Design a protein around this ligand. Structure first.
Ligand code: HEM
Ligand code: HEM
Ligand SMILES: Cc1cc(N)nc(CCc2cc(CC[C@H]3COCCN3C)cc(F)c2F)c1
Ligand SMILES: Cc1cc(N)nc(CCc2cc(CC[C@H]3COCCN3C)cc(F)c2F)c1
Ligand SMILES: C[C@H](O)[C@H](O)[C@H]1CNc2nc(N)[nH]c(=O)c2N1
Ligand SMILES: C[C@H](O)[C@H](O)[C@H]1CNc2nc(N)[nH]c(=O)c2N1
Ligand SMILES: [Zn+2]
Lengths: 411, 411
């Protein structure tokens, strides 16, 4: 009941008590582990909402060393009064900032959480239209990009009410490249976005049908139909990809954007649901070089790179795929570091996370962590997280997945 | 109840019903996932249901469920248990049980081969000298001059837990490790504790960097005894690189036969505490883990030095570069000496085919993603993208405590 995690490279053993505070469910049972399932998982009735608010307020006032205080009980009664009457409640700015930082802090799949306390929270709860959402998002992009000195940020749009007036960003990320099918059968641009790249065209967009076309924003306010907006190109920081040794690398014609900005998740704070909460940080190099470029279902450039290196692609045991993979990821890091755009390699990021884990075990009693997501997609066992046992459990406040809006939108 | 797993690279969806036959527990609950935890006496009372379950499965597989042979065997095992408190497996049952313990091993990527296991019945063995003889014959048979063959040798089952057969070596063939007074280590740092035990038991240590450890063998609960495997039975491979002529000068070699000898085989409630089994290597086991773990031979630096990589900043990916070259060298050396080995691309591709076949013919394939995904180049192998369900079937291989921690010494 008081659990232990061992690092098998260092024998460091930490004891976890934070999991006992867990509230939600994992999808696992004593009979079957679902640890490798990508996604396990209406108006919150008045009965369900108040305990959720109380648990959240309790930890908030605990964290400011005012648990069981004057203002604690007052705020507890005031929110209880507000739920009994309005059937919801509004967070104070301070509570909102705490809830957002702690949603990041509790994100067991995120290797970058050592930075959790430095998040910049933009309160967009006064927003009413998609033009206004576009305005809030442009300011977010510009603030976070910071001319390449990237800064973490989240912008929080108004919370769900009856499920009919949902604020949604239809893009999965604020900045992504278009993808189109070819008349023959191949795919031009990013194959992961083919369905969305169409719903943009199949709703108004005029595509250059290039390979790296920055998609427009599809923004939905108060449950209305979504609207297209182009992010000002001067706000989208992009990096051409060259190699520090191979001058033909430049000729491959590769680029990527500097700002990773997830926009399709649901932020849950004290029972309240924020369906539109785009957040952004900076990249770990393998996200681009390993996954975006080398996934067979994505840009899938391994074959053409290996050919230009003139590797023996006859037999898999020559490890030509692994060799190209390394070079591709050297170039990504080299390109960002040269153009002065923040990026972290998987060695630094995982070493940071071990230090963060030991901070969380020491000052909080644990850190929920999903090994399947934390270990990088290359060179797994030469990073320290590979040898780190991790306990995965769900704390709140949290970021949660939510249905794609086009499947849900009463159009 | 049915359960689905999705391959996110191909969208292939499989349906698991086999998890319904799962008995043992995983360690996970609805509130915590223990998926990354490395490691998460028996009376007549509980033994006959375990025997019945195993014999029902055995007779089902041979299309004889409910037959007179089946009913007679159940009755015969019933009486033998109530009269003698244990029972003996027929040869057919033992072979079936050991193959299925491998087939059920959710952490094993090599299970496509499970039906071709060569089973050696050593249940008539009575002394450590007799154990040495059986293990020598196993090593010679399994090695087969480099054309490796899977094999398991099965010593007598546990009785009262005070007469166990045990192989004290964790693997049949392993290199010694010696802690020096200056704190440094000569040989395999993983084996320092076991090396010390061997020396204390009388082994004259050559004190080199690749000394094959003696066998320490325990029969019938007696004190263990030292034996030296004939060197002509220990097939080894000098490690050279196909492009880097300086790589041979690193002085590296490895043995050809991976043979795990510290696990416990459970069949129908019976416990076989000495059951060495052997296959052939996946290249990464040597090149990634054995050579490049920080806690093992740890040659990343000296390799990256001789390669003259930028070793000042990790973002140069010198560690990942040297890792690939070392793993190319291991595969090249084994193939050149015609010693069986499989690279991680071939092995994971075969496992996906195996897994899909098992879903079709068997209703499931329990699988531990944390262990199946290789320790380098994770996401460019197809298992990274495969959802897996982990559960426990019997017959099974289990961990057991190291015998030096439990043995009662006779003197
Ligand atoms: C600042 C540097 C950051 C780094 C280096 C980083 C790194 C990562 C990486 C590599 C992943 C794996 C995701 C994938 O493979 O697709 C991830 C997941 C995640 N990150 Fe972070 N991240 C950062 C900032 C943030 C911020 C600012 C937030 C929220 C405020 C956040 C929340 C999350 C969440 C919720 C997930 C998992 C979501 C899912 O299940 O898909 N991250 N992060
Ligand atoms: C024939 C080729 C085989 C290959 C390529 C192979 C490969 C592997 C690998 C790479 C692992 C991961 C273990 C580690 O990283 O230390 C593993 C685990 C395992 N293998 Fe296989 N294996 C083979 C044959 C066998 C055989 C013949 C058996 C038993 C009859 C077996 C039983 C197991 C078991 C029980 C585990 C679990 C290890 C543990 O939990 O410590 N394997 N295998
Ligand atoms: C803030 C931030 C920093 C950083 N370094 N990277 C990211 C993007 C990774 C990321 C991705 C996703 C989407 C998950 C889906 C997308 O479809 C492919 C399969 N995948 C399961 C959610 C996140 F919450 C997240 F974080 C975000
Ligand atoms: C039959 C066979 C084929 C093949 N290709 N490889 C092997 C060796 C891998 C292997 C290794 C181990 C050791 C388990 C723990 C011990 O503590 C340190 C960490 N270590 C993981 C057990 C196995 F059961 C096993 F299989 C065996
Ligand atoms: C903590 C973690 O479970 C541990 O490092 C595991 C991870 N996956 C592994 N996978 C394999 N094949 N072998 C291992 O030893 C390990 N070690
Ligand atoms: C099936 C498996 O869960 C899936 O491929 C996961 C594995 N681990 C991952 N890890 C990260 N960081 N990101 C991912 O998208 C995935 N995908
Ligand atoms: Zn689990």
């Amino acid at each position: 009941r008081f659990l232990k995690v061992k690092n098998w490279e260092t024998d460091v053993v930490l004891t976890d008590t934070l999991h006992l505070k867990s509230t939600l469910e994992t999808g696992c049972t004593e009979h079957i582990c679902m640890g490798s399932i990508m996604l396990p998982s209406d108006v919150r009735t008045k009965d369900q909402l108040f305990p959720l608010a109380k648990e959240f307020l309790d930890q908030y006032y605990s964290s400011i060393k005012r648990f069981g205080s004057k203002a604690h009980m007052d705020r507890l009664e005031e929110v209880n009064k507000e739920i009994e009457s309005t059937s919801t409640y509004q967070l104070k700015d301070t509570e909102l900032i705490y809830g957002a930082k702690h949603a990041w802090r509790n994100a067991s799949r995120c290797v970058g959480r050592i930075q959790w306390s430095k998040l910049q929270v933009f309160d967009a709860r006064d927003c009413t239209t998609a033009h206004g959402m576009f305005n809030y998002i442009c300011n977010h992009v510009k603030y976070a990009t910071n001319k390449g000195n990237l800064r973490s940020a989240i912008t929080i749009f108004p919370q769900r009410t009856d499920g009919k007036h949902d604020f949604r960003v239809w893009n999965s990320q604020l900045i992504r490249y278009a993808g189109y099918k070819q008349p023959d059968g191949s795919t031009l641009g990013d194959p992961a976005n083919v369905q969305f790249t169409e719903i943009c065209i199949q709703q108004g967009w005029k595509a250059p049908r290039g390979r790296f076309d920055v998609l427009p924003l599809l923004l939905q306010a108060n449950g209305n139909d979504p609207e297209l907006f182009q992010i000002p190109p001067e706000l989208v920081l992009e990096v051409p990809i060259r190699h520090p040794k191979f001058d033909w690398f430049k000729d491959l014609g590769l680029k990527w954007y500097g700002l990773p900005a997830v926009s399709n998740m649901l932020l849950e704070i004290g029972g309240l649901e924020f369906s539109a909460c785009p957040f952004s940080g900076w990249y770990m190099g393998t996200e681009i070089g390993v996954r975006d470029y080398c996934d067979n279902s994505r840009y899938n450039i391994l074959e053409e790179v290996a050919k230009k290196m003139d590797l023996d692609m006859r037999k898999t045991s020559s490890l030509w795929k692994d060799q190209a993979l390394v070079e591709i990821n050297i170039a990504v890091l080299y390109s960002f570091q040269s153009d002065k755009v923040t990026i972290v390699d998987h060695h630094s990021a995982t070493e940071s996370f071990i230090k963060h884990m030991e901070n969380e075990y020491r000052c909080r009693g644990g850190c929920p962590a999903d090994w399947v997501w934390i270990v990088p997609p290359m060179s797994g066992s030469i990073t320290p997280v590979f040898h780190q046992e991790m306990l995965n459990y769900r704390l709140t406040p949290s970021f949660e997945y939510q249905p794609d809006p086009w499947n849900t939108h009463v159009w």
